[PDB]
Symmetry: C3
Subunit: 190 residues, 3 copies
């Protein structure tokens, strides 16, 4: 049952900032019965904020869908770009609050792409984030401007989408152990 | 999913009551703590004690599975004229016979704050509760917060009660409680 | 989108050792507030590829695990347990591990005691696929019974109960991360 629980006339506006990459070490969780060298995860974060007309009495909207697009150079075929895609659906998105969305690449994805643990160079070649509310686009971020803005829509032989090098939501990473108020709850696979 | 056991075996489940506990999520210690440290908030943890018996008693001491259906009703915080009906199925596997154990479902801190308006909840924000237990697709036990004609309130078709998959009810393995209190509950069957 | 991202002429070879059972405690995770035995089936393996990929990795390998135990609810019958684990970004030329797990309650139900007793694992098998083709097979049996998981017989019954779990479906998910490749999510 995915119909709005809110005012069906409610409209939503989303302000996006930029997607930025942070290299973050995997937590070494301590245990009672007593240590590996932590590997480096790629953590892509984008600040956003939600407003609505009218404002929901609960102070939240049901859900927002984030679509992440990341392009990298194929490390096995150098004249080709790989396009990586991930949809993250958040639930109970607060209104009027500095919030963040995020997606991740594993240490082995980063090492395979770049050749070294933790990465090197500007290995992220293109970035994009599209936000949808009730199936309609309400915000777009891109690392490109003008004609190249929506690069993820460009059909070209030099860039191919792959499900390999999988993009992961926070609940698909070891950072799920760290509950932070700034990220909304992620809707589980249905 | 045919039974690995005697297909004529029947099962009886003794339920106690579903109780709500507000509980902080575990604050896990790490080698290099992050700055700032995570400040866990309070989850809604709905707990129901139960015990199983069977005829005849399975030689292994366990039954294959039991399905728990949870029904929770709250006031829609966005349209206070109506109630929201929240639903969750939890399929437990390897359920021991003759042993006190527990079933549970959860609401996140943001679901609780959205429903009640304050972090950690306030008031009697849970209006109705129900738990239905099935074995091999047959109802064997029912708990309800209501009596009389309102007992099976989750079967009432009404415009003032609306089911929603938002405010999602979570099973334990869908929460930060997954690896804790492991012996208190049976194993949960993963999504198929 | 599961076509290869590699050189399409690449040939992949996988060398398996043997599947072995370890009974292991779940991690006792320390928390700010206060500071049962799983079955852990482990199989070492190593990948080689010709030509060697520039990135040092292949896209994926699919591991199919087959485990047979005596049905504790009827002694004249075997239960066959099955699990597919798809690994991604599998390094080439590097000794690594694959694994599958049974919960404490599965082990206690099968054997009658926490932690297990006896040689309760009766048959084992691991089949590895690359791009949908079998590239390696391990079995606890040789001869006619080698591929015992393909034998149709009323004395062995497949069940999704006693579920086999991948590492990310267990409390071991965030530990020993360097020992195994990444697991592809559902
Ligand atoms: Cl920014
Ligand atoms: Cl950046
Ligand atoms: Cl009670
Ligand atoms: Cl209570
Ligand atoms: Cl062994």
């Amino acid at each position: 049952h995915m119909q709005t629980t809110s005012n069906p006339r409610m409209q939503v506006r989303v302000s996006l900032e930029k997607l930025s990459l942070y290299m973050r070490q995997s937590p070494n969780v301590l245990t009672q019965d007593d240590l590996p060298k932590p590997k480096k995860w790629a953590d892509f974060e984008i600040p956003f904020k939600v407003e609505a007309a009218p404002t929901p009495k609960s102070g939240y909207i049901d859900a927002l869908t984030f679509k992440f697009y990341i392009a990298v150079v194929n490390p096995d075929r150098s004249r080709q770009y790989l396009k990586l895609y991930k949809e993250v659906k958040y639930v109970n998105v607060p209104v009027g609050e500095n919030t963040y969305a995020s997606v991740y690449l594993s240490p082995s994805s980063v090492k395979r792409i770049t050749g070294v643990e933790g990465g090197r160079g500007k290995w992220v070649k293109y970035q994009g984030v599209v936000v949808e509310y009730n199936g309609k686009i309400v915000a777009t971020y891109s690392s490109e401007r003008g004609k190249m803005e929506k690069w993820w829509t460009i059909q070209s032989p030099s860039i191919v989408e792959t499900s390999y090098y999988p993009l992961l939501n926070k609940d698909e990473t070891p950072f799920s152990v760290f509950w932070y108020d700034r990220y909304p709850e992620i809707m589980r696979p249905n």
